[PDB]
Design an enzyme around this catalytic site. Structure first.
Site, mmCIF file in Angstrom:
data_model
loop_
_atom_site.group_PDB
_atom_site.id
_atom_site.type_symbol
_atom_site.label_atom_id
_atom_site.label_comp_id
_atom_site.label_asym_id
_atom_site.label_seq_id
_atom_site.Cartn_x
_atom_site.Cartn_y
_atom_site.Cartn_z
ATOM 1 N N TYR B 508 0.869 -1.153 0.000
ATOM 2 C CA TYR B 508 0.000 0.000 0.000
ATOM 3 C C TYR B 508 0.922 1.223 0.000
ATOM 4 O O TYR B 508 1.041 1.921 -0.997
ATOM 5 C CB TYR B 508 -0.952 0.002 1.206
ATOM 6 C CG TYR B 508 -1.925 1.145 1.105
ATOM 7 C CD1 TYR B 508 -3.063 1.046 0.311
ATOM 8 C CD2 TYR B 508 -1.674 2.349 1.748
ATOM 9 C CE1 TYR B 508 -3.930 2.103 0.187
ATOM 10 C CE2 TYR B 508 -2.539 3.401 1.639
ATOM 11 C CZ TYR B 508 -3.660 3.275 0.857
ATOM 12 O OH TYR B 508 -4.510 4.340 0.750
ATOM 13 N N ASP B 669 -15.681 3.382 -11.310
ATOM 14 C CA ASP B 669 -14.908 3.953 -10.210
ATOM 15 C C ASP B 669 -15.113 5.463 -10.089
ATOM 16 O O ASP B 669 -14.590 6.242 -10.880
ATOM 17 C CB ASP B 669 -13.429 3.622 -10.380
ATOM 18 C CG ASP B 669 -12.651 3.753 -9.097
ATOM 19 O OD1 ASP B 669 -13.009 4.616 -8.266
ATOM 20 O OD2 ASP B 669 -11.680 2.997 -8.915
HETATM 21 C C1 LIG Z 1 -5.265 -0.708 3.240
HETATM 22 O O1 LIG Z 1 -6.342 -0.517 2.324
HETATM 23 C C2 LIG Z 1 -6.723 0.777 2.138
HETATM 24 O O2 LIG Z 1 -6.036 1.685 2.564
HETATM 25 C C3 LIG Z 1 -8.004 0.946 1.296
HETATM 26 N N1 LIG Z 1 -8.481 2.312 1.253
HETATM 27 C C4 LIG Z 1 -7.976 3.306 0.302
HETATM 28 C C5 LIG Z 1 -8.556 4.565 0.888
HETATM 29 C C6 LIG Z 1 -9.398 4.278 1.965
HETATM 30 N N2 LIG Z 1 -10.068 5.153 2.698
HETATM 31 C C7 LIG Z 1 -9.890 6.448 2.320
HETATM 32 C C8 LIG Z 1 -10.652 7.405 3.165
HETATM 33 C C9 LIG Z 1 -9.069 6.858 1.259
HETATM 34 C C10 LIG Z 1 -8.935 8.316 0.936
HETATM 35 N N3 LIG Z 1 -9.539 8.548 -0.395
HETATM 36 C C11 LIG Z 1 -8.373 5.885 0.528
HETATM 37 C C12 LIG Z 1 -7.500 6.192 -0.623
HETATM 38 C C13 LIG Z 1 -6.198 6.630 -0.399
HETATM 39 C C14 LIG Z 1 -5.383 6.894 -1.480
HETATM 40 C C15 LIG Z 1 -5.887 6.718 -2.773
HETATM 41 CL CL1 LIG Z 1 -4.870 7.045 -4.111
HETATM 42 C C16 LIG Z 1 -7.168 6.286 -3.035
HETATM 43 C C17 LIG Z 1 -7.962 6.023 -1.939
HETATM 44 CL CL2 LIG Z 1 -9.559 5.477 -2.223
HETATM 45 C C18 LIG Z 1 -9.432 2.805 2.173
HETATM 46 O O3 LIG Z 1 -10.094 2.130 2.946
#
Ligand SMILES: COC(=O)CN1Cc2c(nc(C)c(CN)c2-c2ccc(Cl)cc2Cl)C1=O
Ligand SMILES: *[C@@H]1O[C@H](CO)[C@@H](O[C@@H]2O[C@H](CO)[C@@H](O)[C@H](O)[C@H]2NC(C)=O)[C@H](O)[C@H]1NC(C)=O
Ligand SMILES: *[C@@H]1O[C@H](CO)[C@@H](O[C@@H]2O[C@H](CO)[C@@H](O)[C@H](O)[C@H]2NC(C)=O)[C@H](O)[C@H]1NC(C)=O
Ligand SMILES: COC(=O)CN1Cc2c(nc(C)c(CN)c2-c2ccc(Cl)cc2Cl)C1=O
Ligand SMILES: CC(=O)N[C@@H]1[C@@H](O)[C@H](O)[C@@H](CO)O[C@H]1O
Ligand SMILES: *[C@@H]1O[C@H](CO)[C@@H](O)[C@H](O)[C@H]1NC(C)=O
Ligand SMILES: *[C@@H]1O[C@H](CO)[C@@H](O)[C@H](O)[C@H]1NC(C)=O
Ligand SMILES: *[C@@H]1O[C@H](CO)[C@@H](O)[C@H](O)[C@H]1NC(C)=O
Ligand SMILES: *[C@@H]1O[C@H](CO)[C@@H](O)[C@H](O)[C@H]1NC(C)=O
Ligand SMILES: *[C@@H]1O[C@H](CO)[C@@H](O)[C@H](O)[C@H]1NC(C)=O
Ligand SMILES: *[C@@H]1O[C@H](CO)[C@@H](O)[C@H](O)[C@H]1NC(C)=O
Ligand SMILES: *[C@@H]1O[C@H](CO)[C@@H](O)[C@H](O)[C@H]1NC(C)=O
Ligand SMILES: *[C@@H]1O[C@H](CO)[C@@H](O)[C@H](O)[C@H]1NC(C)=O
Ligand SMILES: *[C@@H]1O[C@H](CO)[C@@H](O)[C@H](O)[C@H]1NC(C)=O
Lengths: 727, 727
Positions: B508, B669
């Site tokens: 990640y 998406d």
């Molecule tokens: C370990 O798995 C994870 O981190 C999965 N994600 C990704 C994620 C999550 N939540 C939020 C609030 C965010 C911010 N947009 C994000 C996110 C972070 C960076 C990018 Cl580039 C895209 C996304 Cl969507 C979440 O649950």
């Protein structure tokens, strides 16, 4: 020793030469060489330089193409060319005075012009800009505006909307000068209630938010554009008063409902021919409209209409056929399906019933190429009863029993497929041989059909190819249900019928298609056969053209049935031949070919280990009205909806667990919308079937940008090789 | 024993049990068991059926969720749930009267309602419908309309727009009741000039024309929504007069430019706490606004403002930390980075400046969980100096030096990662351990921190797992420049350190991430290790969180650098180890992990044979403003434009010639737009790079629909097996 390789195909190592000439009178043509435009004399073969490659070195614009006026006085320079659909585009234009040797800077043609056309004689201009029609009588003079209703995406004056461009005229143009250059006839399309297809266009990286493209596009059963037809008198154009356009209305038998304007043909200075087609494409009417000096109107006596109906299928191969008028305009000839369902030349006399068949036989006339007072010249596939051959013929008007083949024996082993181009009045013709040997371009005089000279013989390519281990091509037929169905095979070099080969079935199979012919081609299949030793086969089953209606109409209202079946049976037939490894049979196709490929892969016949579908149709409601309804009717309970629904790719998703499948589609495909593949994959996913996929960002139906074209064929080669366990 | 197969993963054959409870008071909690809603007494463990599953068998709709009023007199029935984004959705609601034991049947909550919440005490209701706020004092009485400005996609009252939902509140709701229930504070969002992302939705096979979805969504640097804050006095509502809202204005230091509202916390009946954040997330202001009994106004003394800054990076882990107020609301505690850049608990007093740290050391406090007069309870990673470990601590408010760990030793071998849930006033607490053994839910009394009972020990799942060859997890660290960086490895069963194993790097690596920890997961990696004998590793390099600012902030204004670099260096480190086949090293990541996987694959390091990237970011200008600008600043020439352009995936296309790449993205998406991947593939095609691709029709960022979920992991598993030559 070498082979025809993928890089050769992709990069064009071995180039076909051509000889594209523009007849400019009854005895001269233009020809480009070192970008010098030359004029040639047909009779004697002598030439001089008509335009020096250097003339526009100081133009400050890359020049896309050129158009000399009928009278030699002026040339149109096309630059700033931007492509839209299959035919449409925009460009900037400039006019260069040939006598004065000068660019014209007065009353110039506007940038973003959508269409431009010289009068047929003289040097008048008609053009379309912002969907409106303008006319310049002389290049350096203010133009006259003919229409005011033009409006992007809604009102088209003098050009076609999407579906008219693609399916009806095969052109952007919707303007027709009278032979004189006196009248300008034109069509107007109204797309007001045509729904929009919508898709994203991503563009260059730097674009932050993707663009949404919106194109009026009637899907099967949807609201169609409507059409009007007008004729304007170009001689009487005021500088004060607006141009008075005279409207000609469609026959009442068409006005009752949805219809199309499908052909426009000036017969004389004062006679226009109009073919109209019911939205149900089994009924069309040809109107004959005469100009009236006194009223200034045009009248189409109802009594002189000509009517066509079909009962086995639809009307014409892809559309009602084109009329060819005798010079006086009181009669015409046109291709018509005879009582045995074969397409032959019919002679029609205005104000007389019926027509008279001047040709007959178990074979078909492909086209009417020219007409003189003694002779009618046409292309047909009669020679040796090979439906995949083309030859030039002439039939003596004063005695129909006298038919002379003009090309059959010119060189019987190298040339079996001809097209022709006649001079004005047809004193000369240029014959063009496409195969089975290297293309051969020759010139001939009509008077006694004498070879004058050879224009291009591809000797340069012949030499190169002699050094390469090239594939050969077998064209033959098999018999099913006591019927001959024709097929071809591209066979690997040093072919050995005691060996086993993998076989890739190359499919198109759409109505009136022909994939078995005598044409010489240097294409992807050449590489598969030369280098990877794959047999590439194609087959023309029920639905295929040029063999009569009994076969072509077998698919009427039943797409994705017999033509799908027959592909499968043909592959069964190919294995039984002793030189095919039945464990390695693949299948691929583009557009309609991708649909059929899919239907086959999803048939569960177990004949195909794998296959590729490129930009395929997935279900018929997704495709356009004009094309779809032609074969399928309307998708309504009272019509053919049941078969619309029994004929989707989606509904076969389960059977795809038996095959390796590669689905490919361009995201900006305006024609077979990405939607069609988006629904295929969702159906495969929903039912648990693994498959392979590839999208092409911003490519249309052609996937023809240099990089994408290379990329797709590289991707597909990998896939086919894997499938075949090839090195 | 058999192995833990892909099917087990996708079919959920081995289920983790949970114990989800809701504290309803200082000593009772609600628990649903076999759809029976139960009340529990915490001290003694006894219980009562509060509502029998039988109760709504004739209801008529499937009931999605339920919400019981605080006073236990009413319960909301949520049905017709349609999901929107991550948190937002609409649904229908009925209310059931517990006393009368019937369903209120008039003045119903409308269909397509956007949010509902009970007041904190009693049974008032706030709800949002067509972007406007409504209030019901009693379930049967007609509601009062609080706002009239709501307009789809433009004005949002009481709900968040896309970017606030996702990046700011992690909720659709923008509604805050005072503890009392007297006041209702709400936010208002204006997206009037926020650009809209547009993309196609294909829907079921039967939809003829794709739909185009349009969502106001500020990409980096673009126009952000603006925001207003209001407080209504819910008591003095008039059936004749429009309700009157008092606006709380952001401080002067925020109104000078773009800013956000990032936190709303009620401190007392009449004190509200607002945190604001500059568009440059360098700087935030906490306001303390007091109710003026006479003025009926709310005032925020500037003197009371608390200002939080940063020179190293941004403010907070993902956002300024939440304040925890003491009973009288005259003071509070907050997580803050200290002088050594470590995040610790700080004590603030209203009307005094600065603050006092009550914890410190080279570890970080994760969250403040409960507050009494005697103790503050918090979660940290202090225990055994492990950053990936989690424990509950208490600290004596009258002597900060006296800090006792409440979970560290309950089961030190099974449990090293805990979250916690307190009853009102912290009389009891539920502990929830998540690893490294099976999860274990216990209940406890605060008075002497005594263990009361085990709620769920996962003994069923333990039994099942006995018959399975599970993998094991190693959690160690390595040294990169005298600094420790943690990693984890899912190791195959019967791991033999003499053998070479292929290794998949699971990444990640976004700002403040942690993929090296002590939690127990049953996931894809579990399968890969158990069945295909692959080592799956994750690594927390620079930019990873919970280890202080030096590390987390290394990446400030430079996404796609050190964190990409460090993943690679970890690979090298792993190749060094002697049980790693350095010829079989892959990489893969979703979302941010997709971006990183792509940047690594295009580094040319040669370390990785292949990788998969799922809905990755490709260019930072394509992602949303709140998240991107937090780490990157603005994409202007003035600010950080150069690194925005130096950090794209597209610019690395050439090096992908060196690897096998699989690129996967859902077409619907709404979060990391398909655009992003569309721009990757184009750059790859432009330079002759062959790769694999897969789009998921109508799937969003989660690609979580049951079938697609099954599909993407089946496809990915084939790819990985292929890349490692595994049978
Ligand atoms: C370990 O798995 C994870 O981190 C999965 N994600 C990704 C994620 C999550 N939540 C939020 C609030 C965010 C911010 N947009 C994000 C996110 C972070 C960076 C990018 Cl580039 C895209 C996304 Cl969507 C979440 O649950
Ligand atoms: C193109 O077609 C549209 C759609 O029918 C025409 O618009 C209609 O015109 C009539 C008569 O003027 C109005 O009363 C209707 O309300 C219009 N309907 C719609 C759907 O707009 C339009 O006039 C046509 N344009 C031209 C120039 O032919
Ligand atoms: C939402 O914000 C928009 C844009 O700022 C506001 O629109 C402006 O408001 C006033 C009058 O309404 C004028 O400045 C302009 O006429 C508007 N400009 C634009 C771009 O529309 C709008 O008032 C705001 N809405 C609310 C409820 O706050
Ligand atoms: C042998 O290869 C070919 O024939 C390639 N095609 C396909 C093609 C071409 N031209 C026209 C006018 C049309 C009609 N739309 C088509 C066509 C036919 C069927 C479908 Cl489902 C889609 C399409 Cl686009 C063309 O050149
Ligand atoms: C001189 C004259 O009549 N020109 C007219 C013009 O006034 C009008 O704007 C346009 C649209 O109706 O048609 C033309
Ligand atoms: C061909 O030659 C004749 C006689 O010299 C000449 O009149 C004619 O213009 C020439 N044609 C061309 C095209 O050069
Ligand atoms: C076409 O556009 C160019 C670009 O500015 C302009 O210079 C030129 O004058 C235009 N041509 C005409 C004929 O309007
Ligand atoms: C062309 O034909 C029309 C038909 O009426 C006639 O009016 C006109 O004179 C002709 N044009 C020329 C150039 O003679
Ligand atoms: C031949 O006829 C049979 C009916 O017995 C049919 O099933 C088959 O599809 C036909 N094949 C062709 C090529 O006409
Ligand atoms: C409802 O509750 C009973 C126990 O009281 C249980 O046996 C029954 O299976 C439950 N029904 C469900 C799970 O819906
Ligand atoms: C638990 O037991 C006590 C003693 O009877 C009783 O008062 C209480 O209501 C019970 N609690 C629950 C949740 O049933
Ligand atoms: C919501 O609509 C459903 C039927 O679609 C109906 O039961 C109900 O009357 C509606 N609810 C309200 C109160 O608007
Ligand atoms: C709640 O607090 C407000 C503000 O002081 C007050 O007006 C109201 O009377 C209180 N209500 C209750 C529940 O006592
Ligand atoms: C360690 O320092 C070297 C030398 O500057 C640098 O190249 C490398 O990126 C650093 N590694 C880490 C993980 O800090």
């Amino acid at each position: 020793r070498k082979t025809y390789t993928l890089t050769d195909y992709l990069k064009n190592t071995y180039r076909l030469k051509l000889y594209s000439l523009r007849w400019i009178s009854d005895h001269e043509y233009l020809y480009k060489q070192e970008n010098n435009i030359l004029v040639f004399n047909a009779e004697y073969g002598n030439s001089s330089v008509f335009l020096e490659n250097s003339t526009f070195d100081e133009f400050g614009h890359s020049i896309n193409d050129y158009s000399i006026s009928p009278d030699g006085q002026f040339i149109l320079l096309e630059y700033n060319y931007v492509k839209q659909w299959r035919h449409s585009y925009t460009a900037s234009y400039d006019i260069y005075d040939l006598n004065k040797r000068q660019l014209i800077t007065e009353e110039r043609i506007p940038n973003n012009t959508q269409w431009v056309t010289w009068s047929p004689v003289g040097h008048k201009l008609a053009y379309v800009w912002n969907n409106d029609i303008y006319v310049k009588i002389e290049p350096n003079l203010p133009s006259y505006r003919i229409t005011w209703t033009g409006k992007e995406d809604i009102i088209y004056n003098g050009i076609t909307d999407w579906v008219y461009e693609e399916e009806v005229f095969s052109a952007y143009s919707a303007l027709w000068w009278s032979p004189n250059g006196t009248f300008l006839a034109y069509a107007q399309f109204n797309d007001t209630e045509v729904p929009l297809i919508e898709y994203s266009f991503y563009s260059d990286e730097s674009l932050q938010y993707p663009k949404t493209v919106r194109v009026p596009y009637p899907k099967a059963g949807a609201v169609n554009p409507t059409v009007k037809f007008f004729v304007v008198n170009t001689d009487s154009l005021s500088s004060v008063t607006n141009a008075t356009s005279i409207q000609i209305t469609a026959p009442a038998s068409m006005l009752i409902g949805d219809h199309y304007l499908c052909d426009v043909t000036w017969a004389t200075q004062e006679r226009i021919s109009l073919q109209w087609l019911r939205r149900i494409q089994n009924y069309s009417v040809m109107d004959i409209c005469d100009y009236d000096e006194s009223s200034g109107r045009w009248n189409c006596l109802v009594a002189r209409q000509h009517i066509e109906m079909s009962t086995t299928g639809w009307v014409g191969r892809f559309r009602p056929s084109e009329p060819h008028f005798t010079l006086d305009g009181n009669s015409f000839y046109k291709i018509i399906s005879n009582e045995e369902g074969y397409r032959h030349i019919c002679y029609f006399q205005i104000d007389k019933k019926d027509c008279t068949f001047i040709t007959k036989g178990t074979w078909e006339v492909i086209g009417i190429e020219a007409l003189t007072s003694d002779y009618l010249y046409y292309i047909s596939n009669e020679y040796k009863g090979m439906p995949g051959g083309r030859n030039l013929y002439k039939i003596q008007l004063s005695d129909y029993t006298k038919v002379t083949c003009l090309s059959c024996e010119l060189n019987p082993e190298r040339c079996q497929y001809y097209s022709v181009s006649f001079s004005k009045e047809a004193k000369y013709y240029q014959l063009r041989c496409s195969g089975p040997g290297l293309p051969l371009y020759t010139l001939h005089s009509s008077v006694n059909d004498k070879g004058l000279r050879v224009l291009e013989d591809n000797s340069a390519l012949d030499k190169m190819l002699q050094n390469v281990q090239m594939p050969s091509k077998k064209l033959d037929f098999i018999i099913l249900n006591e019927t001959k169905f024709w097929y071809q095979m591209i066979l690997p070099p040093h072919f050995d019928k005691s060996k086993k080969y993998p076989l890739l079935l190359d499919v198109y199979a759409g109505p009136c298609s022909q994939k078995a012919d005598t044409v010489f081609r240097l294409n992807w299949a050449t590489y598969l056969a030369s280098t990877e030793n794959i047999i590439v086969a194609s087959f023309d089953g029920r639905g295929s053209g040029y063999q009569g209606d009994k076969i072509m109409h077998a698919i009427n209202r039943r797409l994705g049935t017999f033509e799908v079946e027959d592909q499968i049976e043909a592959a069964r037939q190919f294995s039984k031949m002793g030189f095919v490894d039945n464990k390695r049979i693949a299948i691929w196709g583009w557009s309609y070919g991708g649909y059929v490929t899919s239907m086959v892969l999803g048939s569960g016949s177990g004949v195909f280990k794998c296959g590729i579908a490129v930009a395929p149709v997935s279900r018929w409601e997704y495709y356009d009205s004009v094309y779809t309804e032609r074969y399928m009717g309307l998708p309504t309970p009272e019509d053919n909806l049941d078969h619309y629904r029994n004929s989707t790719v989606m509904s076969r998703a389960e059977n795809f667990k038996q095959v390796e499948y590669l689905l490919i589609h361009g995201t900006a495909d305006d024609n077979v919308h990405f939607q069609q593949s988006a629904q295929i994959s969702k159906a495969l996913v929903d039912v648990g079937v693994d498959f392979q996929a590839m999208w092409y960002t911003d490519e249309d139906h052609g996937i023809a940008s240099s990089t994408a074209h290379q990329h797709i064929y590289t991707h597909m080669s990998h896939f086919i090789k894997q499938c075949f366990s090839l090195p």
